[PDB]
Amino acid sequence: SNLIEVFVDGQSVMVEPGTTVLQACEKVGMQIPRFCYHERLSVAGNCRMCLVEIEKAPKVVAACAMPVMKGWNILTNSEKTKKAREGVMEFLLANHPLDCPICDQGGECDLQDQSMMFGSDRSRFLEGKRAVEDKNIGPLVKTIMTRCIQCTRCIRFASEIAGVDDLGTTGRGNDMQVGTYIEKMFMSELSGNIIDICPVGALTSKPYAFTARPWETRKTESIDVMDAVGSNIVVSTRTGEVMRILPRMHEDINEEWISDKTR
Amino acid sequence: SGVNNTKKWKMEFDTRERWENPLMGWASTADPLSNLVLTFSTKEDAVAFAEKNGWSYDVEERKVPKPKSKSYGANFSWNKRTRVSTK
Amino acid sequence: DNTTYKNLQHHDYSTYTFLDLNLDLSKFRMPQPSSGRESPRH
Amino acid sequence: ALFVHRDTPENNPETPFDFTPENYKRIEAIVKNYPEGHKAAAVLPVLDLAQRQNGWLPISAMNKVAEILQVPPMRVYEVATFYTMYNRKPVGKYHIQVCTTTPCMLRNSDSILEAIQKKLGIKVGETTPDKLFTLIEVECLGACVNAPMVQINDNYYEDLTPKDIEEIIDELKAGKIPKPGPRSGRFSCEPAGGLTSLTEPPKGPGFGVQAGL
Amino acid sequence: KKTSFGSLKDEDRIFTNLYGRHDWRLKGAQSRGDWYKTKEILLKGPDWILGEVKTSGLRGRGGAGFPTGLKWSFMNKPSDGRPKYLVVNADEGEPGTCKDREIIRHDPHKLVEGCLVGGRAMGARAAYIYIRGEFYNEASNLQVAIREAYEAGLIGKNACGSGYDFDVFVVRGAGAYICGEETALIESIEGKQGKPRLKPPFPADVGVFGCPTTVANVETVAVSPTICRRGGAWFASFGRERNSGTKLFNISGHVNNPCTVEEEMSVPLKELIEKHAGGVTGGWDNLLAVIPGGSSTPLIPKSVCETVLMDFDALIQAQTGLGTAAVIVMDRSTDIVKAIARLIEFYKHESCGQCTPCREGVDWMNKVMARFVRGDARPAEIDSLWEISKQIEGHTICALGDGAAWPVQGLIRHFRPELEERMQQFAQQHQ
Ligand SMILES: Cc1cc2nc3c(=O)[nH]c(=O)nc-3n(C[C@H](O)[C@H](O)[C@H](O)COP(=O)(O)O)c2cc1C
Ligand code: SF4
Ligand code: SF4
Ligand code: SF4
Ligand code: FES
Ligand code: FES
């Protein structure tokens, strides 16, 4: 009825009003690069990795936050779009630490994978890097905060999903730091989910630390039994040993979260 | 967040015993199908392959994420709870 | 006269001058609107 | 300048702080400025009030502000660390803030900064032993035509020379309050040596008012 | 029409107490024509007031120059049940700019009446005046003027006897140049970090407290009472077409008499410096470069300054911008590289850190610029620096990222030999 027509790379798609540019692209099977955006968190628009060109429009728009307009043609592979991604990736990697060999995220890192797919193949940053101090938020989540890319996913999850306003940002500019300011533990019954949403190895699982790499684990799709909710999980095993538990998306049960006891 | 590994259908078999090699402690197996994974374009293709090979199978419906209503302006609501306390 | 400075009152302003003025202005203000709840967390 | 709090004997959640009964009346006026259901709008003025009462913001002062307004303490910490006018460490009785941005840099704000350093004997970012002065550099203070300028607490001292600032500091040590404003002949932002404009009596009411009201 | 501009008469000047010679309180302001027939203006209704501002050609004095009448008209729509607000941007943070400081402390009643006249045209119930926290005395003057207006019946319940209820609140910032950005300012009023919002939504739809809002510069608001009193056509009779009216100019830096003055739009840049500011230090031939509109606008060399007119369109043709019309003058004794490097250091200190290209990019440019000051770099890095700034520009949430890329582009565009000449000098002393 009220569907409006937009185009993705010239292909017409009908979407409801209020659909974002990022959502319009999904309907034709394209995934826009992202870091700060998460479909179950409030829109942020800060990482700028989703910038995309609208045809015959001088400025690129943040695909995650921009509602589509009737007749828009979204050029998701244009030279302007591709050069926006390369610039943003370059800024993300400027201060990032050369940690991949010792970082648990290695092999299942969105920063690694989107650098490979959408970024340049080399560096022209000739300066020294930022280094941030680490923060203790309890025994379940390890924080190597020099890896943080300031996407604020953890802050939005802590506030909106767990209902806890303990995480935030302090300072500003290049020195803006995610944390609790004071020495405080983040020990919600849902706290372990900030490990999953964090796109980098800034927040990692303390119990899982260093034990395995992603490519070598076999994934068994199973069901949690720590409660009567029936959360869908993936058991990760390696060489006949259970290594970790991850959530498995089920919209009508656990969405994509699990409790700390399950995890 | 990438969704490119959720595009195709897979066929895998039931997991069987893995035990520790006495010499080195490696994980030993007597199951020839432990690593056998097959890719299919559609559910029908996978079922047809299992029927003609005689294997008992369980099929599971594809889980597609629900469409969400996203609104950046909801972060600044005049009177709703969606108003955020930090950016 | 156009030869002398006439903004010398702030020479005798103090720490609470601005907030004292805000407090004294409170009686002239209109009733505030309400969003219907004590806060976004209610 | 660290943006993480570490408890100390003098700065910990049990450090005594509370608004005086008079500052509670002022806080009532502040809160009434904003729509009902949006008390969080008062966070900046109430934090600033606590600084005016206390001289700086201990973690207990931030926790007090959060409690009054029913906002999470983290949302008060974010404001406290975002805005540079909030002092999360004690400062001298006189906070000297020397502008060093380019327009003041062009008018020799370095000579002013070195003159203060040489006199008080403290490098930028330090406090004097008697705890009367704290010296820092700041960005443009919105008084560029009157450069080089400094701000001591709530007052601006402008069109300065190394001699002028040493004179001001001497008055502060003596306990006198020096007069804010230009230390050259002029009064505010007029051109020196005579007005090139507004040399006529200002016109009166209803001058050039268009027909039709 | 008019071919030359400038040499404005005192009778046509709006801020007739710019230098604070005459009394700044209610008595003095009324003697200068303020608060005159304000009742009549209010009863003319929002459409007429908006027509006055549309006809006058007023463009935003905050640094972006949007046509005000069109902008304010976004609020001229039926209510949705939410209150509507006017926010006056008095953050006054742009380096080199210090004109709103004079209006707030010497002509406060023009602003207060501006809030009422501008507020009525938007159907706003109140005006929130955001003022930088450093202007403590200036914000105290403004509160006396507001209190006088309340006690004289000029604002408040049944303002000016017009039957319209309007309030004026003053809100002080706490040290953040980013809080002059319109959405960052709105966030600060709500008690959050001064972090700009993405657009849409636009403030006229969702603004302060989530309500329809308009943010207007102090200078833009403070002139709308006179544009209505004296007529929009009178205002449009100054300056070139689409660059109408008078304008407050700050001339600072290497001039003999740094000052704030009001002049006609499209006045020649050379005329403005020489007539009011007493000329460049060491004479005109000593001029090296000028930043014509605050730190954000790219510099321009002496040759361009010979004939360039001071208005929005003329400065765009010179690959710069009018900005806030804060003229920073640099003579040949200046270290042009260091002067710009200190400007990048300013933006590095002011970035809110919210979005990636400015959080990491501006700091990156600051380090490169610092090295360019000593020549501890290679010429191939200049084009790298140019590319980096283009990656920041147009890819950030707000215009601070653009404002930190333009000064770098201006330096590279006009003083590349100076950069390459410093690198060559550094290299030889290190062999
Ligand atoms: C970093 C930054 C700082 C700004 N600072 C100010 C300021 O101090 N005063 C101001 O009026 N506008 C400032 N602006 C411009 C505002 O965002 C906005 O365009 C202006 O307030 C609109 O008012 P106007 O249309 O009446 O000019 C700033 C913009 C940016 C990006
Ligand atoms: S977060 Fe990703 S890119 Fe960064 S060190 Fe870890 S694996 Fe490498
Ligand atoms: S810790 Fe991870 S999730 Fe949180 S802001 Fe940093 S990168 Fe984002
Ligand atoms: S461009 Fe800079 S100041 Fe503007 S939102 Fe991004 S980080 Fe903040
Ligand atoms: S995914 Fe859109 S800006 Fe981060
Ligand atoms: S540059 Fe120093 S007050 Fe503006």
Ligand SMILES: [K+]
């Ligand atoms: K992670």
